[PDB]
Design a protein around this nucleic acid. Structure first.
Length: 105
DNA sequence: CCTAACTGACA
DNA sequence: TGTCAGTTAGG
């Protein structure tokens, strides 16, 4: 816990190297270095649009079609949508839907 | 509309 | 412990 403040530049661009070293499945070790930032927070920041692996890019016609269809079969099973969309994992497509497309198209 | 952050719930 | 699910939060 602790450091309730937003994820600083000295966390975001620091955890950035730790994932390239360990991988997005060692949040137990990641948190060991960030101390306060528990594995949960680390993953939340990461899985969204922090990932350099997931080059920052906004949704467009060619990506809107992904949630428009996936949400038509899965709906709120972002777990499957995520795996079906190599890149935008969990929060990526989820956060997008219920923010940009919460108005339902 | 786009990404960030914590909180609530689940496997 | 890691992931999923949702809203609130800042941009």
């Amino acid at each position: 816990m602790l450091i309730k403040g937003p994820w600083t530049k000295e966390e975001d661009q620091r955890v950035i190297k730790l994932v390239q070293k360990y991988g997005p499945k060692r949040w137990s070790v990641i948190a060991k270095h960030l101390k306060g930032r528990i594995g949960k927070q680390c993953r939340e920041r990461w899985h969204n649009h922090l990932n350099p692996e997931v080059k920052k890019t906004s949704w467009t016609e060619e990506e809107d079609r992904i949630i428009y269809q996936a949400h038509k079969r899965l709906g709120n099973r972002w777990a499957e949508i995520a795996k079906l969309l190599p890149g935008r994992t969990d929060n990526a497509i989820k956060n997008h839907w219920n923010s940009t497309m919460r108005r339902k198209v």
